[PDB]
Every structure is written in C-alpha cells, then in structure tokens.
Amino acid sequence: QQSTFLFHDYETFGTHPALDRPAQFAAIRTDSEFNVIGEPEVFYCKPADDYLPQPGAVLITGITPQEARAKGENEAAFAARIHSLFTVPKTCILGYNNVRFDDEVTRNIFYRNFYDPYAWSWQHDNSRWDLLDVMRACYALRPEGINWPENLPSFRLEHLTKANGIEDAMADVYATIAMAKLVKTRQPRLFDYLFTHRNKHKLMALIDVPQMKPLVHVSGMFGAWRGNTSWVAPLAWHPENRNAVIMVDLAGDISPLLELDSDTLRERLYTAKTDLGDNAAVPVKLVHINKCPVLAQANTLRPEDADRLGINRQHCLDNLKILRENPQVREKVVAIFAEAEPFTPSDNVDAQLYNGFFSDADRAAMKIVLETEPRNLPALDITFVDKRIEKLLFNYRARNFPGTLDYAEQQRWLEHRRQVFTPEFLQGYADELQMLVQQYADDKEKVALLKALWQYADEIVH
DNA sequence: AAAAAAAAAAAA
C-alpha cells in the first residue's frame, strides 16, 4: 500500500447528478510526484431506456446516446468499475471542480447501484481534493512564478495550459495533472498547505467563533472581479449542518445585518441581484469544511495582493470591529438558516440520496444484493428498513437487468416510461432541439448531433 | 465515518 493520487473527470448527459446520467469516465493514477502509475482508463456508461440526455450537454461533450449505448456497459457495471478504482487504499481522489460536480455524480451513481455513497472518500486512508480552488488560491495569494491568463483571470484548463507552455475527458485529466505539477513546483509551501488543509479538522481549527477571528477565503462565489477572494469572519456554526460555518464577507455591506430581522434577511439573501433594486445584498456566506474550502490566516493575503485584487482592508477591519460589538447579529444569521422551510425532496427515489445515512443492517442487506445473481434477485428473501431501498432495487433491476423482470414488473416499468415520456415532456424536448438547430444551422457538426438526439428519442419512445 | 437537496452567490 503506497499513497497515490487518482485524477479523474466525468462527462455527463446533463447537469443534475441525481436526475441526469453519466456518459463517460476517465482516470489516471499517479504517485505523490505526479508520475503516471499503470494505465489511463476511459469508458462509457450505457443510458437506460427511461432517460433522454439534455441537448445542451451533448453539444458540449459531442457524445451521443447512441455512442454511449454502443460502447458502454450498464450503470451497475459502470458503478462497480469506478468503485473498484476509487476504493484502492490510500488514494486521494481528485479532479478539477470535482467537489461541486464530479463527486456528486459519484455519490449518486454509488447510491443508485448499492455502493456506499461516501466511503471512497474517507475509508482506508482515502481522501479527496480539487485543483480548481488550488489554482484560484495560487492566483490570489501567491501568483509569482506562474502565468495567469485573463481578458478578469480565467481558470479554464485550456487557458491555463496554453499560458504556461503545456499541451476531451482524458485531455482534461492530463491537463489537471500538469497544473498540479506546476503549482507544486512554483509554490510548494502554498501547495502543501492547501493539501494538508483538505482535512476538515485542520480547517475547523482555524475558525474561532467567540472571537470572530478573520480569515482569508478564496471561493468561486466571490467572483473573478475580486480574484475570488475576501476576508471573512465566522458568526456561528450552521444550526442544521454541522459541516457548515456561517461567515460574514467583511468586504460587503453589513447594514442589512444590523437593520433587518431574520425573516427579511432570509428573503433578501435568496433574492436575485437583479431583483434587489435599491437594497444591499446580504454579505453572508456558508463555508463547508467537508468541501476542501480554501481558508488561511488573515495575513496570508499580502497587502500587495489585496491591492492588486481591489480588496479594501480598512473596510473589512471596520465591519469586523462593529460586528464584534453587535452579537445580536449572530442570532439573526443563524435564524436565516434555522427558521427556513425544510427541504422536501420529490417522490422520485433517484433524488433522495440526502434523506439520510443507511444503517449497518441495510448496508449488510445491500451487500447481499450486490453478491446475488441478478436472475436470483426476485427469489432473494430479504427485508429492508429504509423505504428508499425497495424503490432503488426496482429501478436497479429494470434499468440494468430488464430480462429479469416478471410480467407485472414489466408492466410497471412500461407505465414508468410512459409517465416519463409524456406528450408534454416530448414536446418540450422537440422544441428545445428545434430551437438549437436554428441557433446552430451553420454548424454541420452540432446539427448532426441534434439529429442524433432526435433519432434516439424517436427510437426509445417507440 | 459519512450528508443535506433549492433558493442566492459565480462560472460554465
């Protein structure tokens, strides 16, 4: 057991990790110095017959459902394959924007196919990381030694590689490795600091709530116009999510926090910028310590870089001093999150991963499912406590092993498909394709893609 | 040991 990194990327048929499906997965394993270990893998996932890909996604990836169907395996097999790669001990699974996207795909694919949704990222000394915020952090805090493309800095891999003398899912993986190498070379101490601080316990320690100790925070939510950076201070741990802390963005306008009550603050917080009119935005942001957030002591952002980024230290310090003497603000921000309407998921079991953890007993039961021949599942004498499992099991069987359904199950699946491919859904889908063909009438390649999508839909619904 | 869905923020 030697420590390795497993760089990876998915291409999918849509943006929703629960309701859309993966098309392709690519991975490359390296040692701690980013020398390639073994052989790159890239493989496709065959979409089940109750799904149509989002046209926008296919135009981005160039991957048709026909293509994935032809050279992919079903999702049960696609899941097992990735699961075996991910659960090699002492693996740090990472990518580029994976925490907010690819990792969610992983969790849901495991969930739908009876694998633990999270163990790949913690068990047997595994962990995860994400190079996107590393690049953003390097640009904001220690940009020396690297060339940063702009027009506003860009963090697209293609732009980042071109600007630093460096040469598709597999392509993205190779490029992510190259940026990792670069930053480790030019800013080894920042790199190692970020790597060690992927651990939520090192992060948690930086937060001091009673003191409102200020920190620098680099986040895509701050925006390129300020180099994704600001000084923040913790107001309270989130009342419902123990892995979230409520931060004030010290660079913002704290008026609303002092003036408004929690109900108006909540309303305002979830108001679109373009709907705010006269009113100041609420300068509150959640930091999720289990999501590899970039946090460091306040002085990690040098005055020269605050200046470069257009961030005003005295303004932040001013806000901080005022907040420290207005503790009533803490109560109010917690209320924004504590007194909100609970989130009720839809009755679609695909969307219920976050309803709760499964028990040890259910895990044992799911383990047996995975060890049973599909043809023998119907005869499987077993019982489940979590009410999601029977629903997941029916979907699992119908999507992956349709030959194993009895007549009544066949009829149920037929009704499910009809309830998906309604005349209203099919017409929305037709109108989207027609709109896109118009938008791209001059582009032979995209038009052929849109034609494939129409043909796939026609086939699947007849 | 593991989590939180959407809203909004941002970038794609």
From Swiss-Prot:
Exonuclease domain span: 7-178
GO biological process: DNA catabolic process; DNA repair; DNA replication termination
Site (Interaction with single-stranded DNA): T12, I60, R107, Y118, W122, R136, F155, K200, N243, Y270, N290, Y354, F357
Effect of Q297A: 2-fold reduced ssb-binding. Weakly reduced ssb-dependent nuclease activity
Effect of L317A: No effect on ssb-binding and on ssb-dependent nuclease activity
Domain ExoI C-terminal: 344-461
UniProt binding sites for Mg(2+) 1: D9
PROSITE patterns: EXOI_C, EXOI_SH3
Segments forming domain ExoI SH3-like: 188-341
Regulation: Inhibited by 10 mM EDTA.
Molecular function terms from GO: 3'-5'-RNA exonuclease activity; 5'-deoxyribose-5-phosphate lyase activity; magnesium ion binding; single-stranded DNA 3'-5' DNA exonuclease activity; single-stranded DNA binding
Catalytic reaction equation(s): Exonucleolytic cleavage in the 3'- to 5'-direction to yield nucleoside 5'-phosphates
Listed result of changing Q438A: No effect on ssb-binding and on ssb-dependent nuclease activity
Listed cofactors: Mg(2+)
Cofactor note as given: Binds 2 Mg(2+) ions per monomer.
Result, substituting E144A: About 2-fold increased ssb-binding. Weakly increased ssb-independent and ssb-dependent nuclease activity
Keyword check for Oxidoreductase: no
Binding site residues for substrate: E11, R156
EC assignment: 3.1.11.1
Function summary: Degrades single-stranded DNA (ssDNA) in a highly processive manner. Also functions as a DNA deoxyribophosphodiesterase that releases deoxyribose-phosphate moieties following the cleavage of DNA at an apurinic/apyrimidinic (AP) site by either an AP endonuclease or AP lyase.
Subunit structure and binding partners: Monomer. Interacts with ssb (via C-terminus); this interaction stimulates the exonuclease activity by recruiting the enzyme to its substrate.
Domains (record comment): The N-terminal exonuclease domain and the exonuclease C-terminal domain form a central positively charged groove which binds the DNA.
Stated name of the protein: Exodeoxyribonuclease I
